[PDB]
C-alpha cells in the first residue's frame, strides 16, 4: 500500500479572496505536494466551477496552474486538489488537499458633497459602471446618480435637515450581471447663508432760532396751605432778570421755612438763541424740601415758560410751554430715604409756527447741573432739610414731534454690497442683533436697542428702524453707527454681517 503525501494550496491571490477586478482576470493557483510516494511528474487535478484544471508535480513538490479564470474562482469558493502517485511495485495512492477562499466582488466609492447642488463624481473605482441600459440610479434619500452624454456621472444632492436625528449620509448600490457591486456613499454636507454688510445713512437737521428772554411763572397749583408765588429774591430762590413769579412755596413750617420750588431761567447762557434737535436747558429747577406739618403741601403745580421766537422778517411769535409737576411731600420718619420728597415732571409739549413750518418744544426732563451729558430723569428725590437742583431740559424738533429722525430698511436687501445669500436650507431669520462688531443669537431681535447715537429695532424678517436720539451737538463729522446681526437657516447655520448707518448733520 503506497504512502500518501501532503498536498497544500497557497492563498488564492495575496489576500486569499477574489475581488471585482480579479473577477475579469486569469489567476495563477499554486501549492505543494510532498512526502509519501509522491514523485516528480505525478498528476495534479482539481475541479473548479465544474471545469477541471490539471498539471504535474515539479521538482521539490511544487505544482502550479498557469491560468484559472477569475469567474470560476468567484463562482466556486472551495475545491480539492488531488495528486495521483504510485510506489515501486505499482500500488496507487491519492494525496488530497483542500483549498477555501473568500469572494467579495464589491467596491465602494466615498464622497463628501454639498447639499442642494449637482456634482460630477470623480475617481470612481476602476470598472465602475451602470448595467445594460441603465442611465440613472435613485439613492436612499431619493437623489439620483445620472450618466450623462459626456460619460460623466452626476449626483444631485438633496437638501437635508442637518440638525435632526436622521443621518445625512446618502448611499446607493449598483449591481452588475457578472456579480460586481459598487456602493457609492455620499456624505451630504450642510450649506449656510452668507450675510452681507449693509449701508444706510441719515441726516439730522441743524437750525438756529432767535429767541427772546424767558419768563417763567407759577400759574396754578392744587392743594397746599399758605401757598405763595413770587419773583425770586436773594433770600428765597435767588434773583432773575424779570418780574415773573419764578418761586412757589407752601406748608406750615414745622422746623424753619416753607418747602417749594424755584426756577432760575437760562437767559444769560442761551444768549438769545435755540438750536433744533438739541437738548437745551431753559433754566435751573430747585426743589426746596423743608419739614412742614401734615397735609399742607401741594400735590401738583404748573409753570408757564414763555418766550418769543423771531423770524427773518422781524416778526415775533409768542410761545408758552406749560410744565406740570406732580409733588409728593411724604410722611417723615426715621428713614431718610423713605422721608424724601418726590417731584415728577410731565412730558408735555407745545407747537408753534415759524416761516410756514411748525416746530414742537418738548419737555425732556431733569438733568444734573454741570453734566451736559448726564442721565435725564423725570422724577427727583430730595431729603428733608435739603434742596436739589437740576437743569430743565427741552428739545425743539421740526413737525408735530410724534417721531424722531429715522431711517429704515431690510438687511436682506441689496444695501450697497449685495443681498444676503440664504443657502440651500432656507427658513432664514434674524436671530441676534447688537451694537458693535460681535453678535450671537440673543433676545434683542424685535426689541429696541441703544446705539451710539440712536436706537434700533431689527426684526426677525430683516426689517429695521433706526432713529437718532443724540443731540446734534454730539454728532461728530463722520459719525457712524454699526450693528452686527446674525441670521440662521433651517438647521442652525449662522452668518453675521454689520448694518452701518452714517449719521450726518446739515
Amino acid at each position: 500500500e503506497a504512502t500518501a503525501g501532503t498536498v497544500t494550496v497557497n492563498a488564492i491571490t495575496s489576500d486569499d479572496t477574489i475581488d471585482g477586478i480579479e473577477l475579469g482576470q486569469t489567476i495563477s493557483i499554486s501549492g505543494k505536494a510532498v512526502g509519501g510516494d509522491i514523485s516528480v511528474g505525478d498528476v495534479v487535478k482539481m475541479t473548479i466551477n465544474n471545469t477541471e484544471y490539471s498539471t504535474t508535480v515539479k521538482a521539490g513538490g511544487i505544482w502550479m496552474i498557469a491560468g484559472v479564470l477569475g469567474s470560476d474562482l468567484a463562482a466556486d469558493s472551495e475545491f480539492d486538489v488531488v495528486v495521483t502517485s504510485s510506489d515501486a511495485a505499482g500500488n496507487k495512492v491519492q494525496s488530497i488537499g483542500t483549498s477555501t477562499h473568500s469572494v467579495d466582488l464589491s467596491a465602494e466609492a466615498n464622497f463628501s458633497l454639498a447639499e442642494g447642488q449637482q456634482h460630477v463624481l470623480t475617481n470612481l473605482p476602476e470598472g465602475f459602471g451602470f448595467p445594460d441600459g441603465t442611465t440613472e440610479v435613485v439613492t436612499n434619500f431619493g437623489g439620483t446618480i445620472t450618466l450623462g452624454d459626456d460619460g460623466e456621472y452626476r449626483y444631485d444632492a438633496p437638501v437635508r435637515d442637518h440638525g435632526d436625528a436622521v443621518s445625512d449620509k446618502d448611499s446607493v448600490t449598483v449591481t452588475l450581471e457578472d456579480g460586481r457591486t459598487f456602493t457609492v456613499n455620499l456624505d451630504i454636507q450642510d450649506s449656510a447663508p452668507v450675510a452681507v454688510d449693509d449701508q444706510d445713512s441719515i441726516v439730522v437737521q441743524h437750525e438756529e432760532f432767535e429767541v427772546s428772554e424767558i419768563a417763567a411763572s407759577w400759574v396754578s397749583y392744587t392743594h397746599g396751605e399758605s401757598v405763595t408765588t413770587f419773583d425770586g429774591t436773594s433770600d428765597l430762590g435767588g434773583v432773575d432778570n424779570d418780574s415773573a413769579k419764578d418761586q412757589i412755596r407752601w406748608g406750615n413750617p414745622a422746623e424753619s421755612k416753607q418747602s417749594g420750588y424755584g426756577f432760575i431761567d437760562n437767559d444769560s447762557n442761551l444768549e438769545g438763541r435755540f438750536d433744533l434737535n438739541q437738548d437745551i436747558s431753559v433754566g435751573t429747577f430747585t426743589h426746596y424740601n423743608y419739614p412742614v406739618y401734615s397735609g399742607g403741601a401741594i400735590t401738583s403745580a404748573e409753570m408757564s415758560v414763555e418766550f418769543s421766537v423771531l423770524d427773518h422778517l422781524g416778526v415775533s411769535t409768542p410761545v408758552t410751554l406749560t410744565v406740570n409737576f406732580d409733588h409728593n411731600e411724604t410722611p417723615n420718619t426715621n428713614d431718610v430715604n423713605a422721608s424724601r420728597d418726590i417731584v415728577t415732571v410731565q412730558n408735555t409739549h407745545v407747537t408753534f409756527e415759524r416761516d410756514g413750518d411748525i416746530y414742537t418744544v418738548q419737555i425732556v426732563g431733569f438733568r444734573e447741573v454741570g453734566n451736559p451729558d448726564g442721565e435725564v430723569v423725570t422724577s427727583i428725590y430730595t431729603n428733608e432739610n435739603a434742596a436739589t437742583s437740576y437743569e430743565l431740559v427741552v428739545r425743539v424738533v421740526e413737525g408735530d414731534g410724534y417721531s424722531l429722525p429715522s431711517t429704515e430698511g431690510n438687511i436682506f436687501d441689496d444695501n450697497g454690497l449685495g443681498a444676503d445669500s440664504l443657502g440651500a436650507d432656507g427658513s432664514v431669520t434674524v436671530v441676534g442683533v447688537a451694537v458693535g462688531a460681535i453678535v450671537s443669537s440673543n433676545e434683542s431681535v424685535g426689541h429696541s436697542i441703544e446705539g451710539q447715537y440712536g436706537n434700533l429695532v431689527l426684526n426677525s424678517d430683516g426689517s429695521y428702524v433706526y432713529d437718532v436720539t443724540a443731540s446734534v451737538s454730539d454728532i461728530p463729522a463722520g459719525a457712524t453707527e454699526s450693528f452686527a446681526y446674525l441670521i440662521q437657516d433651517q438647521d442652525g447655520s449662522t452668518s453675521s454681517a454689520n448694518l452701518s448707518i452714517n449719521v450726518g448733520t446739515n
Binding site: 414745622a254 422746623e255 419739614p291 406739618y293 397735609g295 399742607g296 410722611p331 417723615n332
Partner: peptide, 4 residues
C-alpha cells in the same frame, strides 16, 4: 409731630 407729623411732618412731611
Amino acid at each position: 409731630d407729623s411732618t412731611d
